[PDB]
Design a protein that fits this description.
This is part of a larger assembly, with 3 copies of chain A (485 residues). Chain A has 485 residues and is an alpha/beta fold. Chain A is built from 15 helices and 24 strands. Chain A folds into 2 domains: 232 residues, 3-Layer(aba) Sandwich (Rossmann fold), CATH 3.40.50.300; 235 residues, P-loop containing nucleotide triphosphate hydrolases (Rossmann fold), CATH 3.40.50.300. The complex binds adenosine-5'-triphosphate (6 copies) and magnesium ion (6 copies).
Amino acid sequence: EHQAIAKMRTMIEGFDDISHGGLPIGRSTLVSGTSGTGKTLFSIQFLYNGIIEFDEPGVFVTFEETPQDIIKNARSFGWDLAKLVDEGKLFILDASPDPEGQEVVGGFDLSALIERINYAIQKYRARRVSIDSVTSVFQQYDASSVVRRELFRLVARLKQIGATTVMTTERIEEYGPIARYGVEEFVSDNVVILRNVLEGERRRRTLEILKLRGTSHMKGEYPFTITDHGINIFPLGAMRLTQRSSNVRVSSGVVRLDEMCGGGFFKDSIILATGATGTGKTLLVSRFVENACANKERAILFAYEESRAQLLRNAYSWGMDFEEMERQNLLKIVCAYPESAGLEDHLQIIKSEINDFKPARIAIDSLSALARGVSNNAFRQFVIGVTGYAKQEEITGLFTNTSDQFMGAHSITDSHIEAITDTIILLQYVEIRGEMSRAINVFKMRGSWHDKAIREFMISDKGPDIKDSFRNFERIISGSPTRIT
Amino acid sequence: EHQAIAKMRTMIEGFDDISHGGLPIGRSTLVSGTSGTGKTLFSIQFLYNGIIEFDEPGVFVTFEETPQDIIKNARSFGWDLAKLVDEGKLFILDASPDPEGQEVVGGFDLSALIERINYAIQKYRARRVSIDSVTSVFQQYDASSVVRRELFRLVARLKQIGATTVMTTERIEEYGPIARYGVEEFVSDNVVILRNVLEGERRRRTLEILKLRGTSHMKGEYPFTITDHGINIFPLGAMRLTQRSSNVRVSSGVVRLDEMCGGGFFKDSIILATGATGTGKTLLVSRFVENACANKERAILFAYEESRAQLLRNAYSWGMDFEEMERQNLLKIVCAYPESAGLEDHLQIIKSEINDFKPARIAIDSLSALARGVSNNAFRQFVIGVTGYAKQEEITGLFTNTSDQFMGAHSITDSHIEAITDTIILLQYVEIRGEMSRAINVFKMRGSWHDKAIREFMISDKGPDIKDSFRNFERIISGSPTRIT
Amino acid sequence: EHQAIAKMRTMIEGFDDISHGGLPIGRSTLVSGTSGTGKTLFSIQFLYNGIIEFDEPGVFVTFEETPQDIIKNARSFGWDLAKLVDEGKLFILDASPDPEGQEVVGGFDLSALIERINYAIQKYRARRVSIDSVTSVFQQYDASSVVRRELFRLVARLKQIGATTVMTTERIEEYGPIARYGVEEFVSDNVVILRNVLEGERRRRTLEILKLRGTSHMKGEYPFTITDHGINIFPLGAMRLTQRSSNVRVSSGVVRLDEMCGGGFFKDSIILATGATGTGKTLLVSRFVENACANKERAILFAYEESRAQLLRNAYSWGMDFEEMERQNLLKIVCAYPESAGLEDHLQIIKSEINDFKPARIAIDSLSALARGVSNNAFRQFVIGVTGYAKQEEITGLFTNTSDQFMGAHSITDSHIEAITDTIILLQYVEIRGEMSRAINVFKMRGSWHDKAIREFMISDKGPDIKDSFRNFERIISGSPTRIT
Ligand SMILES: Nc1ncnc2c1ncn2[C@@H]1O[C@H](COP(=O)(O)OP(=O)(O)OP(=O)(O)O)[C@@H](O)[C@H]1O
Ligand SMILES: Nc1ncnc2c1ncn2[C@@H]1O[C@H](COP(=O)(O)OP(=O)(O)OP(=O)(O)O)[C@@H](O)[C@H]1O
Ligand SMILES: Nc1ncnc2c1ncn2[C@@H]1O[C@H](COP(=O)(O)OP(=O)(O)OP(=O)(O)O)[C@@H](O)[C@H]1O
Ligand SMILES: Nc1ncnc2c1ncn2[C@@H]1O[C@H](COP(=O)(O)OP(=O)(O)OP(=O)(O)O)[C@@H](O)[C@H]1O
Ligand SMILES: Nc1ncnc2c1ncn2[C@@H]1O[C@H](COP(=O)(O)OP(=O)(O)OP(=O)(O)O)[C@@H](O)[C@H]1O
Ligand SMILES: Nc1ncnc2c1ncn2[C@@H]1O[C@H](COP(=O)(O)OP(=O)(O)OP(=O)(O)O)[C@@H](O)[C@H]1O
Ligand SMILES: [Mg+2]
Ligand SMILES: [Mg+2]
Ligand SMILES: [Mg+2]
Ligand SMILES: [Mg+2]
Ligand SMILES: [Mg+2]
Ligand SMILES: [Mg+2]
């Protein structure tokens, strides 16, 4: 009846979603990767979480490191492994080579290693075991035939013991063999690969589960970051299209625009404002976050094109006061360049700021800034992540997207994200009698009636002023209309 | 007279179509692939199906696994191999190395292995044999010259016995050599390759038959998935252009549109609705599935851009009630992100939901959502698969495709799938006197008369309201017409 | 005086054209390729044809196969090698290793092999010899220096005997070395390579002659297929631009169109009908094949976009009766998806159906369907092949090509095949007073006067109805004209 294999949760954020419940119990898992991919962190975090979350003792077998550096490095992540050792929950088995040039055999006594591991497991009643570097042994006997045999023996004995084991191995190439010998991936039952791929001049960390014998999992690579709390994976494919909806309305900060939108924006919606540079997109954003503050709601403004000081100045020139909204702890401004962090990191930053500040609304100053140097697929996934999260958390979201052209536009955005957006506002230039006028239109609104008029508007020190449609002109959308009466 | 070689059906969905009847009888088949490609599953599923479908006993020769893990892993697929062993239909021959560092010869007694296999075959009257890993032997003698000889001996003896054998081997590279030594593909009579190709950040499983001596087969790769029921292959090239047709009509849910279509849509047809975001494509979809329910017919709505909760809200705003249609078990809504599954998996999901719910109609909320991150060829094949299936099963199908531009469109779709579609509905924006109006046109309808008018329409809380053509304007299709009277 | 070297015809369709008369007499030919490329079939088909066509006895030297499997596999192609052995015309020399682990020398007695071959040649008065796998010997002594020497000895002795020999060798990579050792291509006088290249997810079989010492040949790769009758090569470059012409006219099935074409279409011509989907291209095709049947001529309709059942329905809606035309054995309908076969196979299928049915006319339902997933060069070659063949066989050919856009077209086709077509018919949409009207124009006709008018036409249940030109409008070709009076 499709009986599942029982699994042990790793509690590594996002991992248990990818693996569909964690790692199979009583089996080994092989974690491979190039230097700097976070293999050691994965195997430490595995034992650490087991001990504190489930009260499951464990053993860390060390070959390259020493117990002192394992503990010292761990401290950077907020956890204390020395404490767990003193309490008899964590045990580190030191199998290092020692800083000596002496040798006796030239090989390695695998049998002795296994018996020492078995002893440690029984003594501490370990449920979880990690091995620092299996291949640190095989270097003394590097034929693929002997590697297969010796690895088989280690894996088989661990199964007999019953402890769940995470073995660490190593690779040279990001897209080369799973492990050095082309053997380990055929012997082990469960294979996980950590990568740190260099593309252009940036690095992207990704995790993949190649296989889990006897059980299902998500396939392909999923991005992750290493932060102060350890490994945090972001399996976008695990996000479901099950977000809630409502008929609750919120003001845009602009009264006439609220009328055009049929009584304000929906609270539970994504709003995209597009247009050429200088059309006033950031004016609507500033008024949006102000309205939240006016009603004593928290809001976060994520700035990418302008510094905080410049935002304050421009806001004052429009009759707004950002410093006052900050003093009341209603408005928070987060300024960074798109280039200061990876796209994966920007997503994490947005989520972290939301979790700490608990906003009713957020705004993204420029999606086109975030798209710089980003492929269409990578960018789109970011947008889906941010908008999906905002919907999930019931946060009203206003997003800005700059057009690459100011006349003759055939489209509203070139990012192809208008299928994600619920409400679209267009700001465009219109050339009337030798002058560069502006116009505003509500292009669509999924849950409501909206105005159809393309209305002229002006920007003053009181903010936007929306007037009448261009009734006596043709070809307004093109930006270069002709007068007919 | 072109005498065919008799074949043994594998009963692996789609495999017997690719192989033109299964595997040649009394011959070996070599199945190669990288770790995690499902080689073991293929060879187990082969023996399993033979035993339950044709009552043909078989032998599984094990080198890396143990009988206990073979059985335990198998259980995840719903079948019980332990039961078949107890009944004397399935036999597992344990040729594992044992978890010991001891050795006697350093090579392998192939003669002893063959005699043990022969014994098992005669004892259980086996017709089918599988070998877990032939190359687990060759590792002890890795010269290409000895591998060729020893493999030849194994294959030749199996032919003399008469049992049909599926041998498993291994590869390192997806597009490299068929097998490790560059030998096995020249010795074996029948060669099958399983791949798990990483492209971008996604994996695609494919199956290929490289050759079958003395018999024809389909060529190239064919996609497959591994599901709860084992391997399921989707050989699109095996689908025939032989679908039925009729003059039966069904209502669109919109009375005026039914008139434009000459008396409703054809039941046995594919309908494509295209247009820019905000033109009301999802309004027609909602009314389409409602009409089915109104007549007490089942329908499935496959949602990609909107969650269930949002669909319910938007439907209520248009005077519809989706929850009631669900309570009557007439309407089913399936919501998922395009990124949550592979394109191959989306096709399988659609087919599975149809098989379980038995709909009269289906609708695809957004083909352009499914096309995200998908090459033109991969996408087109998906569309052919879904539409071909819907025609085959006599299911009325409504598909939505968003335009990337809202003005100056030269085409109806950029996916080049309009040659598949039988009926095409276009929704466009028309700029009239400074406002963004909408228009609807039936572009084509293969089996019927249709209206030619491009008609203005409005969307209210009663749904679409289709009016008159723009008789006094020119250049309506461009979206920015000029008035002439 | 440019004395040629006498050649021996292989009678392998297309091969003797590429080789300019077959293989040089009294010399060896090396056939290399990867597993599954049809090397064995080539060498068997060579001996087989020699025996039945020229009554030339031959010897097949076997290393990997056994006589029983050679015969059994051969039967699938309709020929019986056992019969030829019994009659003393075909001899199979068994040089297999036997299914034994025993060895005496560890090398190979080449001298003994040669003497056995010589004996067989004299005994059966062989003129043709094939060798199953030369490299099955060299595996026991794999240095490039010994391979060169031993191969030289074999080739030199065969020349002294005088028999023409086709040797088989093997490769790992499709575009790598000609043979495993980088030797055989320098020793042998005549080198032929068989490939099975994987591009995207499809395989293409091609044949190339790398060199023939002392004689000319066609260069580069030429596509081939393996069918029930063995290897069939399609050397498009061997086709000559020497097709016949005449002033014979045939009706289009539409009376008014016949007038526009100056008295009907030329019998010996290629007619291309282009336009956007829904312009009635398939209406003209249906009437075209009907006219043939009306005059009691056979015609084949090759369908790619529509099933037979749908074609019948749509034809009935236009006042036609396809089933009746089938009963009289005048109309034949061949339905398949473009994806069901390779482009090379589609060409072969068209030729085979023509040879069996002996049509006066053929029609291709959609060239744009066949172009799916096909590069511009591969597609164009297909079109040249089909149209060249149709002209050669004096078959009137009507081809359909769908436009990717319906407004603002600058061109008639994007396939760049209008230079092949003799007569071009354009169907376009014209937007008149808010409606989507249609228009028909004869764009060109190489051998005749044709009308210049762009005429409005309607489609009813009586088929097309062609009226008057748009005399009072400008910019008709653009599809969005303006009225001037
Ligand atoms: N507190 C922290 N905050 C952010 N990043 C950190 C922190 N601590 C460590 N890192 C990063 O995480 C990475 C973890 O490296 P790790 O030791 O897991 O690599 P490894 O694969 O074990 O190395 P090797 O392959 O040489 O054994 C480090 O390269 C470091 O840059
Ligand atoms: N005090 C003011 N009075 C009148 N007009 C102003 C004032 N402040 C700004 N503007 C106008 O607003 C425009 C800038 O708009 P805003 O900064 O809101 O968005 P944007 O800069 O167009 O967006 P992007 O950052 O993509 O360019 C300027 O071109 C300027 O003419
Ligand atoms: N119940 C299930 N549902 C979905 N997927 C499954 C299920 N059970 C197994 N799988 C997947 O199918 C794959 C089958 O792997 P399999 O053991 O066939 O690989 P293999 O080629 O035999 O491995 P190796 O090359 O190491 O011998 C697994 O990697 C697993 O992810
Ligand atoms: N209750 C309503 N009254 C008036 N107009 C409405 C109402 N509900 C929705 N609309 C209009 O319908 C439009 C959305 O149409 P719909 O959601 O059916 O397809 P779509 O969203 O254009 O397709 P896509 O998802 O590709 O954008 C909105 O722009 C809005 O103006
Ligand atoms: N009756 C048939 N109809 C269609 N195709 C066939 C038929 N018989 C054989 N074939 C195909 O033709 C191919 C001929 O393979 P062939 O034995 O020539 O390969 P090979 O190069 O000799 O193999 P190897 O390199 O392993 O010696 C087969 O792979 C098979 O798929
Ligand atoms: N009985 C009929 N009465 C009136 N018009 C019809 C009838 N049958 C079909 N039509 C019209 O013919 C059009 C389809 O034309 P046809 O199928 O001949 O070529 P096509 O479908 O445009 O070519 P493609 O397959 O490339 O789209 C439809 O759009 C429809 O309006
Ligand atoms: Mg480490
Ligand atoms: Mg700005
Ligand atoms: Mg396996
Ligand atoms: Mg929609
Ligand atoms: Mg062969
Ligand atoms: Mg057609």
